[PDB]
Amino acid sequence: GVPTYGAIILDETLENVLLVQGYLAKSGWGFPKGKVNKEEAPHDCAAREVFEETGFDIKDYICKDDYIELRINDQLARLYIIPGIPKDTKFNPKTRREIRNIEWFSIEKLPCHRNDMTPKSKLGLAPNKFFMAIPFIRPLRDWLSRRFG
Numbered sequence: 413g414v415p416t417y418g419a420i421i422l423d424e425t426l427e428n429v430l431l432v433q434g435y436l437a438k439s440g441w442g443f444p445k446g447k448v449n450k451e452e453a454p455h456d457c458a459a460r461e462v463f464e465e466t467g468f469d470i471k472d473y474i475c476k477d478d479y480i481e482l483r484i485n486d487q488l489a490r491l492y493i494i495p496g497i498p499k500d501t502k503f504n505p506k507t508r509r510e511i512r513n514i515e516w517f518s519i520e521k522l523p524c525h526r527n528d529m530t531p532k533s534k535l536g537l538a539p540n541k542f543f544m545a546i547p548f549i550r551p552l553r554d555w556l557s558r559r560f561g
């Protein structure tokens with residue numbers, strides 16, 4: 413699959429992260445990201461996608477070695493970590509046809525896994541509106557502990 417790039421934007425307290433909500437197949441909450449174009453550098457893709465989806469330009473703040481990358485079903489998604497963005501920043505997507513809403517969420521309150529259905533003796537996982545974000549949450553908490561404390 414084509415690699416995706418984007419960002420994990422945190423506020424100044426390091427408490428909260430910025431998620432975006434799309435439509436239809438993308439109707440839940442996730443980190444702003446999208447597919448790399450032909451010949452496009454990872455940092456330029458990240459900034460382009462984040463600006464398209466949030467109206468915030470991360471180009472001046474990207475750090476080359478500060479990211480979390482996960483391979484999910486043989487597709488690579490890399491989110492650059494961008495701390496210290498004020499909570500009163502005005503975010504507006506390019507594209508209300510693509511982005512329903514943009515909100516800060518408390519990291520400590522976000523799930524880092526979906527819930528099973530063991531009370532119902534049924535296999536699988538319960539739906540969760542943070543499905544796309546969930547894989548990055550434990551790695552982000554661990555990354556923050558190693559960098560900041």
Ligand SMILES: CCc1noc(C(=O)NCc2ccc(F)cc2)n1
Pocket residue numbers: 432433434435437438439440441442443444445465510511543544
């Ligand atoms: C496949 C199930 C699913 N549900 O929500 C998503 C998802 O990606 N949402 C975040 C997002 C990211 C970028 C974007 F442009 C719009 C929305 N996927």
